[PDB]
């Protein structure tokens, strides 16, 4: 369309681990008054949520110390929550929801949302035909977008939807897997 | 008559530094002491080093620290002072310490990996290198994986993982681990297996009080809070239903079910007293508890979260009184100090709760931060069991809503009816490291022998080892002397102090007089570990963004980490590792068993986790049991 | 399997579009369900009649929030109706009208989901669509293998020239081109079958077919009016090998979005001074393909 990021220019979010940073490090930085300080560059995952970071040290002088948990909130003013079930059955039709959130304080968004074609699924999307809706999301609200699909192959299969707003440089995509199980 | 005495812990451990306290009472000049350790019965001579010299300038008090290598097993400890042999048979523990087990998450799906760590520490909580056996058991208690690993060269950290099969029994799985040499002492974590997806918001259910008072016309009032894991408030609808638990079994109250709007992330719901009692003689309900179950659905139907607050006790009083911290022995004729512990019904300490002994009638003292108040009564010189009732004097309350509790103390029995006593006391405040604690020594004896007492020997027991021993000197005529005792992080989570004096009194009669006191210390890490942001600035991170984590900790410490989506904890927040859980395991492993004093001097030592043996034949009874009485 | 709930959903035209959605639900217990949810999604471009929703909200054992009630043509793409109970002895039924506010070709089925509040796992879901047999997307199934059939009925329809025919029939993926006669039409509920005699293999592909052999072509019933294939008539057909169905040597052909299906006027209809051009274009096209084959 006129004045909107093209589907192919959107890189979907995909890294949605429940835990990460399972790491071991010794505090051997040159100490001051008995204390060593370590700086770690971490790459935040793609989840929009709050991570709880827990540290435990072991010292031959001080024993064991479980630290107070440290929280980091990762967010965005516009995003998709692709709410997939844990698993689905081969050849059974399901409805999944893409929930679009607008957390801008006073700006409502005209949004184009699309379900991507995938030959592992039957849906209204084909190779030659897009399945795209234009919706308006008011300030500080959300819109639930339903999609009907049929899994056609078992194993770990993937569902992807993307959205962009007209007249702004805002877009999002979510690419997630679910387990497809035989009949 | 020089009397030589030896003091050690009741239970000795293997491959750890133990301390034997050595004293020559009424000695002159220097006195050589060789201390020996042997297997019982027979001879192997397991510890054979350890000599020292007792000295006028150290007032004939000293040491030797020793390490044992490496039914129930015993050793014979043997001290030879000059030529004088003093020996004691002592119980031996095969325990290496504790194991703490950490998983990355609380709950898992089939076909994922459980990442976990065992922390191998001794009884001081210091890293220990040992062989550890591991087992993962399914819900029905069948072991399905076992490792056998050493934590040698490993700084007390064993990193393991296990892959959940796709074909697996749902439910509570268990990790069980023990040191190779103590298969009797097994440590466990549970994790949940279940098919699920992460929810996008959390639901919190908070009753306005942590209990229900049966005569509260208002019923049980409850707030429901729903917010997205990233911060924002939920708009939605709540279904909340109440029920009654006793004590394993639950009865739903179907008439209590409500549907409410969650507006601005919030909604209000009540269980009226009338619906409560209809659904079931109101006093029949005290001692049972209430649960609240809430289902919240986003207004779109697109996500749903269930939560429950349970174990909300139905009460006549907002408070409970506990004597768990008060000695169950008194000195007839001397004041008796009670440490009164007051909790909220859920178990948390109550702050600023006034308490008093039956009647009173002036008196009264206020509970503190830790829930503890100190009272003291005066006592008759009779040998009859002392029976003390304490309440609870909350204004605003009313007599029927005040807590009450009764306990009994028995008399400390003296040597050949001498009527000589020692009484230790200590101001009740929260004790932190960096503070000094004044320990008060109050002497009761006849003026005809009092001048013979020139010192007290004190011993500090902590985490099952003799932390510290010393002397508190005394002048003739001094009823009260005070020891300024410096508290450090070595004293966490708590400790016992025992003191004693000795003399020849009645008819050449050798007398030992002992007292002891249990002191709580504020719990924290011995060291320090802070995790925080490193970017000196700014608003919330965006998906995929790089940030700097900063870790501040003790030089040389191994640090292990994990980051967990807080949506995991909406599903399950049980079994997480915590410094609190670590100190709880530590205090449960105390070899002292009692809040203090004892039935006689021997009981004082033994109850506090110490042996005492003198060359004149004064000694504690043998401890053969690896656990405390109950 | 809907173990805990019976759910019948129905969509019918009412007495823009407007239709009547009726939802009939029953609990499979010896007792009535307590508080339950109807979670409803719209067919794309439809919205509840608000007056009809107000009537339902005033009904006993039912709640529809002011939230839902003053949504709009704007975006009641979804709706939740709260039920205070659901009967276990008979169906608890409700209906309301839906209006088309935005019209599109290709409307996605709506869906209705029932469950009791306390257990989201024990739910039942039904779909609905004005032409789709209980809300089901089109797909062709052989044992446990399905393939999607939710695409254009066949290729396009500004002139049709010899040149475009030649270009299009020579595109890299085109596997067969036939002149056919329709011997028999078999109509059914989901897929129509068209038994074509293959009168000439203009281009031969991976299906080894002799002259005059019948092959069966398959099309979704929703394509029936647009194809209007008729028995005893001739057609020019070509397509991709991606559209074979079954296993050799008994292949069927799916008629899909990459299949050319053209009416070939009969030998004596070709004289009519309005079939002449098209008939010569078919004749030159055939001659070119039969001799030259395809230019790549």
Swiss-Prot record, chain A:
It comes from the Eukaryota. This is Complement C3c alpha' chain fragment 1. The gene is C3.
């Amino acid at each position: 369309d006129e004045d909107i990021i093209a589907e192919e220019n959107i890189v979907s979010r995909s890294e949605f681990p429940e835990s990460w940073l399972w790491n071991v490090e010794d505090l051997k930085e040159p100490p001051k008054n008995g204390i060593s300080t370590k700086l770690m560059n971490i790459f935040l995952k793609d989840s929009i949520t709050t991570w709880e970071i827990l540290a435990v040290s072991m010292s031959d002088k001080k024993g064991i110390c479980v630290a107070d948990p440290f929280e980091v909130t990762v967010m965005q003013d516009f995003f998709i929550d692709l709410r997939l079930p844990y698993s689905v059955v081969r050849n059974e039709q399901v409805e999944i929801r893409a929930v679009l959130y607008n957390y801008r304080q006073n700006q409502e968004l005209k949004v184009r949302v699309e379900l991507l074609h995938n030959p592992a699924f039957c849906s209204l999307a084909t190779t030659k035909r897009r399945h795209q809706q234009t919706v308006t999301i008011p300030p500080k609200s959300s819109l639930s977008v339903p999609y009907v699909i049929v899994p056609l192959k078992t194993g770990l299969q993937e569902v992807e939807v993307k959205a962009a707003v007209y007249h702004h440089f805002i877009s999002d995509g979510v690419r997630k897997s679910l387990k497809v199980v035989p009949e | 008559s020089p009397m030589y005495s030896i003091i050690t812990p009741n239970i000795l451990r293997l491959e750890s530094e133990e301390t034997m306290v050595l004293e020559a009472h009424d000695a002159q000049g220097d006195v050589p002491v060789t201390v020996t350790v042997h297997d019982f019965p027979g001879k192997k001579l397991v510890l054979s080093s350890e000599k020292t010299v007792l000295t006028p300038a150290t007032n004939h008090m000293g040491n030797v620290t020793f390490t044992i290598p490496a039914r129930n097993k015993f050793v014979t400890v043997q001290a030879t002072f000059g030529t004088q042999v003093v020996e004691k048979v002592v119980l031996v523990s095969l325990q290496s310490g504790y194991l703490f087990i950490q998983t990355d998450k609380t709950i898992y799906t089939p076909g994922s990996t459980v990442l976990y760590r065992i922390f191998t520490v001794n009884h001081k909580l210091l890293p220990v290198g040992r062989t550890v056996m591991v087992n993962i058991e399914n819900p029905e208690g069948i072991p399905v994986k076992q490792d056998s690993l050493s934590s040698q060269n490993q700084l007390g950290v064993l990193p393991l993982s296990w892959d959940i099969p796709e074909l697996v029994n749902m439910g509570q799985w268990k990790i069980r681990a023990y040191y190779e040499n103590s298969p009797q002492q097994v440590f466990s974590t549970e994790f949940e297996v279940k098919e699920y997806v992460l929810p996008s918001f959390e639901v919190i259910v908070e009753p306005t009080e942590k209990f229900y008072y049966i005569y509260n016309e208002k019923g049980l009032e409850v707030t429901i809070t729903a917010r997205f894991l990233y911060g924002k408030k939920v708009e939605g609808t709540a279904f909340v239903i109440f029920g009654i638990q006793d004590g394993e079994q639950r009865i739903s109250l179907p008439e209590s079910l409500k549907r409410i709007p969650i507006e601005d992330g919030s909604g209000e719901v009540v269980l009226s007293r009338k619906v409560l009692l209809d659904g079931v003689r109101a006093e029949d309900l005290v001692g049972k508890s209430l649960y609240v179950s809430a289902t919240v659905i986003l207004h779109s139907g697109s996500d749903m979260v269930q939560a429950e607050r349970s174990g909300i006790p139905i009460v006549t009083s907002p408070y409970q009184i506990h004597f768990t911290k008060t000695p169950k022995y008194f000195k007839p004729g001397m004041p008796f100090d009670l440490m009164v512990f007051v909790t909220n019904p859920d178990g948390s300490p109550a702050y600023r709760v006034p308490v008093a002994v039956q009647g009173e009638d002036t008196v009264q003292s206020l509970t503190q931060g830790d829930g503890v108040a100190k009272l003291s009564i005066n006592t008759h010189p009779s040998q009859k069991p002392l029976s003390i009732t304490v309440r609870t004097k909350k204004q605003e309350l009313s007599e029927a809503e005040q807590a009450t509790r009764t306990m009994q103390a028995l008399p400390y029995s003296t040597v050949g009816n001498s009527n000589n006593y020692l009484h230790l006391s200590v101001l009740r405040t929260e004790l932190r490291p960096g503070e000094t604690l004044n320990v008060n020594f109050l002497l009761r004896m006849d003026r005809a022998h009092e001048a013979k007492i020139r010192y007290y020997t004190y011993l500090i027991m902590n985490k099952g080892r003799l932390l510290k021993a010393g002397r508190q000197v005394r002048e003739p005529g001094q009823d009260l002397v005070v020891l300024p005792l410096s508290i450090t992080t070595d004293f966490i989570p708590s400790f016992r102090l025992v003191a004693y004096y000795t003399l020849i009194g009645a008819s050449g009669q050798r007398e030992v007089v002992a007292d002891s006191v249990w002191v709580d210390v504020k719990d924290s890490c011995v060291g320090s570990l802070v995790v925080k942001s490193g970017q000196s600035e700014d608003r919330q991170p965006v998906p995929g963004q790089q940030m700097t984590l900063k870790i501040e900790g003790d030089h040389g410490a191994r640090v292990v980490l994990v980051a967990v989506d807080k949506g995991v904890f909406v599903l399950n927040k049980k079994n997480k590792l915590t410094q609190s859980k670590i100190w709880d395991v530590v205090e449960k492993a105390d070899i002292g068993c009692t809040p203090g004093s004892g039935k006689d001097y021997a009981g004082v030592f033994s109850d506090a986790g110490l042996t005492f043996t003198s060359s004149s034949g004064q000694q504690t009874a043998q401890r053969a049991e690896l656990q405390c009485p109950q | 399997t809907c173990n805990k709930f019976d759910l019948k959903v129905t969509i019918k035209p009412a007495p823009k579009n407007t239709m009547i959605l009726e939802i009939c639900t029953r609990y499979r217990g010896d007792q009535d369900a307590t508080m339950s949810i109807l979670d409803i999604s719209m067919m794309t471009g439809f919205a509840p009649d608000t007056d009809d929703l107000k009537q339902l909200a005033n009904g006993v054992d039912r709640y529809i929030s002011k939230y839902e009630l003053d949504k709009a043509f704007s975006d009641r793409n979804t709706l939740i109706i709260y039920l205070d109970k659901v009967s276990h002895s008979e169906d608890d039924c409700l209906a309301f009208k839906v209006h088309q506010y935005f019209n599109v070709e290709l409307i996605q089925p709506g869906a209705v989901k029932v469950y009791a509040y306390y257990n989201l796992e024990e739910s039942c879901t039904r779909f609905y669509h004005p032409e789709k047999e209980d809300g089901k997307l089109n797909k062709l199934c052989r044992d446990e293998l399905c393939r999607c059939a939710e695409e254009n009925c066949f290729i396009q329809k500004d002139k049709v020239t010899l040149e475009e025919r030649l270009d299009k029939a020579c595109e890299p993926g085109v596997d067969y081109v036939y002149k056919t006669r329709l011997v028999k039409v078999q109509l059914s509920n989901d897929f129509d079958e068209y038994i074509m005699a293959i009168e000439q293999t203009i281009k031969s592909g991976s299906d080894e077919v002799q002259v005059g052999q019948q092959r069966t072509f398959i099309s979704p019933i929703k394509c029936r009016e647009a194809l209007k294939l008729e028995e005893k008539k001739h057609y020019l057909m070509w397509g991709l090998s991606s559209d074979f169905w079954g296993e050799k040597p008994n292949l069927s052909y799916i008629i899909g979005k990459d299949t050319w299906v053209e009416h070939w006027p009969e030998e004596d209809e070709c004289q009519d001074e309005e079939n002449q051009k098209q008939c010569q274009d078919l004749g030159a096209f055939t001659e070119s393909m039969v001799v030259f084959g395809c230019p790549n």
